Amino acid sequence: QKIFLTVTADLNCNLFSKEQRAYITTLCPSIRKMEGHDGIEKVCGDFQDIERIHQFLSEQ
Amino acid sequence: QKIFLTVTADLNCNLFSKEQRAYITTLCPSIRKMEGHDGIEKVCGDFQDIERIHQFLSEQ
Amino acid sequence: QKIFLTVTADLNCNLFSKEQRAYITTLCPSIRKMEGHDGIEKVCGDFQDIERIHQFLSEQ
Amino acid sequence: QKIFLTVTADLNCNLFSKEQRAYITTLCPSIRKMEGHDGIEKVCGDFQDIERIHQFLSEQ
């Protein structure tokens, strides 16, 4: 089965814009998002999507 | 410059025993954990730690 | 003087409709939310915000 | 049936010592806790229990 049933990550919203963090919807379409007027602040799902999101923000 | 301010993982406690999950606090001594009648169910820390915990459990 | 830095609540999506849970963004404009297929599933914010949400929903 | 399935609160560990925070074990022996070497950082449980902990901490 799965090692991690789910993984959640608090995003740095000082470091990355609404526009940068909004791409996560296209990068990982089935990632669950905690979102404000400030855009995506937390993400939840498979460890593979958290890695993919970390890779993506790491490059910005 | 933290990408993920924190990261939290839900451990699959069906796949892994209390003894197997117990080592996580030696593996990552500054980890934070949530602990029931069958030991460690959830963990919180750096991305690096959650990657090391995934690596470790992945090899059992 | 924050006692709770943030507070997250899991909503009883069986008890309340998408239309009932949808008002939360109008009730609490500054709130953060996570939206599955049947609307808002989880909410993050201030204690006071989570309190007013409990009240609003308790009277449906 | 209940309004909030669970509630989680990030505790202000700057405003409240390890020892003040440790009493939450006595206050709500049923509350699930995220804890490391500065003690309880996050609590998860029933709305009523979150209220009691906020009520306790606010009375300090």
Residue numbers in the entry:
A (entry chain A), B (entry chain D), C (entry chain B), D (entry chain C): 132 to 191
From the paper:
Deltex proteins are a family of E3 ubiquitin ligases that encode C‐terminal RING and DTC domains that mediate interactions with E2 ubiquitin‐conjugating enzymes and recognize ubiquitination substrates. DTX3L has a distinctive domain architecture as it substitutes the WWE domains and proline‐rich region with three domains termed D1, D2 and D3. Our results suggest that homo‐oligomerization of DTX3L is important for the DTX3L‐PARP9 complex to read mono‐ADP‐ribosylation on a ligand‐regulated transcription factor.
Using mass‐spectrometry, we identified that the amino acid sequence of the crystallizable fragment started at A126 and ended in Q200. Taking advantage of the presence of methionine and cysteine residues in the protein sequence we solved the structure by sulfur single‐wavelength anomalous diffraction (S‐SAD) using high‐redundancy data collected on the long‐wavelength beamline I23, at Diamond Light Source, UK. Despite the anisotropy, we observe a well‐defined electron density for the protein, for which we determined that the D2 domain comprises three antiparallel β‐sheets packed against two α‐helices. The asymmetric unit of the crystal had four copies of the D2 monomer, and the interfaces buried in this oligomer (973 and 415 Å2) indicate that this could be a biologically relevant oligomer and that D2 assembles as a homo‐tetramer with a 2‐fold symmetry between adjacent dimers. The larger monomer‐monomer interface corresponds to the head‐to‐head arrangement between the β1 strands of adjacent monomers. This assembly continues the antiparallel β sheet of the monomer with six hydrogen bonds between the strands. Sulfates are located at the N‐terminus of helix α2 and each of them forms a hydrogen bond with H185. Taking all into account, dimer and tetramer are stable in solution, but the structural features suggest that the dimer might be a more stable assembly.
